[model samples]
Target chain A: MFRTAVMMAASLALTGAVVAHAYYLKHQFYPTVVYLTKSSPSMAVLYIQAFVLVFLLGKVMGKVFFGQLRAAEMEHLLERSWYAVTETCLAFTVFRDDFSPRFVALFTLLLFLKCFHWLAEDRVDFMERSPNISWLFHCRIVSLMFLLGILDFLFVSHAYHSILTRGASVQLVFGFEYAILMTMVLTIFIKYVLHSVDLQSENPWDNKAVYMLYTELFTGFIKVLLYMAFMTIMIKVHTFPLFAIRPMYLAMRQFKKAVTDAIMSRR
Target chain B: MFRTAVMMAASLALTGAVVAHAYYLKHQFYPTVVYLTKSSPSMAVLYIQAFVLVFLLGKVMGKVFFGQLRAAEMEHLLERSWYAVTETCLAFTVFRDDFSPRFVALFTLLLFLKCFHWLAEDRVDFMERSPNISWLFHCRIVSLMFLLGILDFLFVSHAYHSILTRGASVQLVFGFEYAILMTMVLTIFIKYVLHSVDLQSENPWDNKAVYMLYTELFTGFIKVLLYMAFMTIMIKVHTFPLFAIRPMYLAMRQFKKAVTDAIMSR
Candidate 1:
């Protein structure tokens, strides 16, 4: 089942690549990175496809690998993930053309949902079952992933300088970062709800895996969107950099602590 | 102590009323019920004088009338209230003439801090204590308060003829509500910290009220700057709402149930 899912994902990736090439032909070559960045709608589409396919595949594989789940739990995670990814993709794709404040808000929320799920999965696992994971190791790993997102947001913001650069007294980076952190926290709680639901014994998929996916996806998306929003709002508002970085640092710390549980035992 | 505090508060209130009248003349209207509603530096100063005077008196009176705080649990509540009012007043005073997003963000955060502090105090006193509260009551109260804020936001948004009113989109409501809620949550958490420091003292006021005041003043100021920085990004860079009220609805319900149960048994 997992193989099939992977194969299907590969096919979608190929299709997206082809579409991207066609798009570039019509639009003129801006840069190769644009394809991987938020500038290219095709790229965003590619990611959505990747995330959704992987999520479904994960759900299916969970049932297959861990044994049967009650239809309720199976449907719950699958349904929510599908909605989360689909809504996010749709929102991102639609707003691709217009990076206005409202659009940014919608797109960021959607992306946050995706990114959060991606980052949250492993931590949930380490927490539920005792793992030999080191706290520092978790910190570094999570921070690395978070950094990737931060860079991605920066790239997008750079593409559209007005998002963060042109703004007046508002200070975009700080505002966007603030939004990102708040959303991340809220989404974490959302994942927590699903996590509890999936933990039921009768559920088909391994509770831990589904939750881990949800958390990671949501976290990843939020990190990226937060950065993008930062650029947009910064150019529009123009606040402080240190202020923006604080939340990122705080988020990293929290994620690190969660992952490292040589400490959880003492508590 | 109680009488003196009351007298001071009364004087502040009188002073605040006069300031409000003077501000109305300058701004060309009456002030909104929400503190710091007007973005005028001069008016903001008047608000500070009023807010501080009332709060200090309230603290002293709370000491005398509320029966001396019985324990330190409530001290955080008062301290946070004072700090938030001070920060918000200062923030508005600094940026009142300018309607920049930074100012908006600061104001929004200050509003959050204020609301959150109250909510948190209620939570500590009513929720997680020797007399545990019910989730049912918690849900009702929180939801109601959230709804109130939403309605107020809608009213203000409409009154201002903002992009929000151009077309009644769900996104506008969603954004507005979310921002308000997030502010509420963070401020409440700050209150929790204050409460933690004052935890489980049989005589809550054993520590001087002034000490709690100083601590919250310090923390509150820190929060003010932190949130201001946060707004700098949110308003200027990303422009996303700082929070949402919808998600907390479930927790509110559960909290209310807990509180109701606690009370019934008593």
Candidate 2:
């Protein structure tokens, strides 16, 4: 009890400090009814911007490479591409450190990854009996998501490690934050192990449910961190924290392609 | 192309300024071997921490409220409780400007809202035909999620209106950011008109698909904003942006209860 009390006191004190610091940052401001900040755009706007960029990209990708994307298919595209964009979005969070070149590198690599996946997804489905099963399998091995997850893991791990070793008490807090996320990505990886083998339905929900339950279980647990990472990305995606769904309405649909696959075969 | 070129040049110059400003802020630092800040924890850590808190909250709520909560049910709780916590988390983002009393009010009200729903959900399920049909109907009209969305809309709108009127160029940029998000919420509201009437599949994916397809259409358009709100909530949830899923793996399941409701009745 005493320790908890002491912890609260310390936390309260720090909260005050952070609050006061924000006030101090507003050294030259006075507005009777202002929302906040001139330093950067709010998180919501940037998300809209990212959404626009991804949506347009998918529209183009569909019209060009595949065919006219159906509404359902376009929805599929949204789920497919959602995380890839986030990877870049998250990197921008870290870039706030001084507009690091890594951001540019990341943005480049991400697009290339998207290009590879956009093309490969069709091949895995369309050219199945016609061609290089081995080549396709190799491509599958480096799935866009798998690579992006790896990218997140390594990058955050690198940042966390670098931050930690320095041993600054202040920096360590941020270090630990990255540390937890690194761990989540590792957990995220373990998820694909079952996924890769296809041991996965609400019928759709059950099949989708099995996958979703785990996702929620993982995401719900890591949700706080996910939200925070997003906020950092928001500030940083826009600023350069090192900056930062249901969400509920849309997720269970993730397994559409696979769930329908086993039923009757298109051929 | 010329205008686009000019815009690009201006953007590039602003980028330089922002970059330099960050360097200046770092006034004292030397760590080739560091992840990042002293000012804040990186985004990843906080998310895990939140995950931990919410998971535990669900566990406790289940044990205490109704029953032993199945693994599936627990996942259910995760989905159910996910956004309420975010509402508080987002408020914290704004509080970063200067820890406002509203953050505290929101935290309290949100928990109350959750409590109301937790009790009401079971009542609608188990006690139906036993009591209070009209009351339950009204209660359903104000679903936990529906209310929370309302909560989010009003608060952000309040903050945006306050921010926009002053008319500072720099402030307006943030103002517009909030403005667009507020617009997204209104669209979010339009969604329920269809939702309230029924009409939501995947089988899991199809039923899940209908709701989700729409969500994505709305969210996909508004997604960039959603991501930023999250970023803001993260920073602010912790500091107080003002604060901010698979995204992919789990969305299709949104309709499990409703979809299953028709086949044979529970």
Candidate 3:
């Protein structure tokens, strides 16, 4: 009791001294709200591009090398690659960008790769574990969403830029959308890592690590669900006149690839 | 690449749609700022009082009836209590006084109890096979933390309320300062649980389950550390000087009480 009283007194004194200093740093007459600083458009473009490349490379490598690698090695290699990509995003978000597509493509590309790699790994895992049957086949219906976003940007950018320099195509918009989607996917991976760490360490009844692993997997996929919901809501609100379900409907129905030996292959 | 292109097109259209909606919502202007919310004095008083009462009652009850409960059962009981308290906080935070001290005290009290109980249970597990020493002596530190927190809140509240209702008296302020110091001693319980969890969950690397369990414990305590730091900063800003170091100094002395009974007796 006596001790708490004394500590409270000291806390009061310390607060008095520090508030004056913090107040000096905030010279604005009123409380200022902080908004997200915008990324340089060109830099953002570069990030998106790099994210796509890394993702594709990671997918090809993971598919080829997964059989030879242990789970721990696979986990770390994926994590380290992911860390660098996202760290680039965080730094770019906070710092300066000089209207260069270099940084933008690099960051966006990394994020895009993250999303692509998640699907690729999950597909391979399911194929190796359960032959002939696959979540990847049906799941791609949902995964193929938000592509319209690419087309919208592509059309707008092409029209706007063409009036100044050159004509842009649907392909360019598609590339941009792919990169952004990849980064969004990367964010979900980070969430899984965080959730897994929290669950395994705290719950006593988690006598086996299997449940913790399951939670990580479950929560990761939940991100995909929410991501789609967000995209739908966003699309409905902004492009009311432009919104059409035809493309998505068509994409969802079609299976362009055959169930090859790849689907039935073992790790 | 073609697949990605198609996906991005969808994303672009959706983002454009959402951005437009968001702009409309902003322009419609739905009360951008909150002005009416303020802390309630009554709620704070109720919280401090209930916090003390529940902790005292729980400790006495545990010693009398649940002392023999094993690590598993005790862990389950504490966890259940934590969730119950959490639900209460959630319901209260939304509907009732948002920053009600009553809720804070009860939440903080239960949170402390649950953590300490878990720590005690961990110590029990570590000593389960060993028969030479009395683990209860170490376990008593858990109860001591609750007892100290209650005592500190009681005196601190009185001192703080006196400052607002009557004027800040040198004598009253001194008393409050002392209570806060006692609370800092209680803070050692946080570290105790951290170490105890680590000790009990031996070989964190060998088992994936053990590794995950410690990770949560580590993350949870990191939050606790942040809370303590925030409180310290708040107190310092309020100009209460003597109340800070005295509790921490006292907690350092209590570290000896945390060891096994054999170690302490020696």
- Every candidate's chain B TM-score: 0.35, 0.33, 0.29
| Model 2 interface CAPRI class | incorrect
Provide fnat values for all models in the order shown: 0.00, 0.00, 0.00
User: What lDDT, from 0 to 1, does candidate 1 have?
Assistant: 0.46
Off by over 4 Å in 1: A1-102, A106-131, A134-160, A163-267, B1-39, B68-72, B75-252, B255-266
lDDT of 1 by residue, A1-267 (tens): 678668676768776676667576557565544545544445555556654665665556443222334334444555344334333333232222343445444445434434444345334443334334454644543443454456546534543465445643322332343345455545544544454454444455554554555465557556755665554653343232222233344455555654453235335
What tens digits encode model 2's per-residue C-alpha lDDT throughout A30-143?
631132322233323333344345545544544443434333444555544553444334433333333234344445444544544444344333332223334444444345
- Ranking of all predicted structures according to lDDT, beginning with the best and ending with the worst: 1, 2, 3
What digit string (tens of lDDT, one per residue) describes model 3 on residues B1-266? Answer: 46644655655555455445445545643421111112232233334445555556665656653346565766676545534443333333222233333335544553554445444445444454444444565656556556656755675676667667875334343343344344434435544555556556655424433443443344334434544553564355433232223224333334433333224333
Error of 2 at A208 (Å): 24
Score residue B241 of candidate 2 by CA lDDT.
33
Candidate 2 stretches greater than 4 Å from native: A1-57, A68-77, A80-267, B1-58, B68-73, B80-266
DockQ of each: 0.02, 0.05, 0.01
lDDT (CA) for every model shown?
A: 0.46, 0.43, 0.42
Clashes of each: 88, 76, 102
On the 0 to 100 scale, the lDDT of residue A168 in model 3 is 30
Number of the predicted model whose TM-score against the real structure is largest: 2
The interface RMSD for candidate 3 is: 13.4
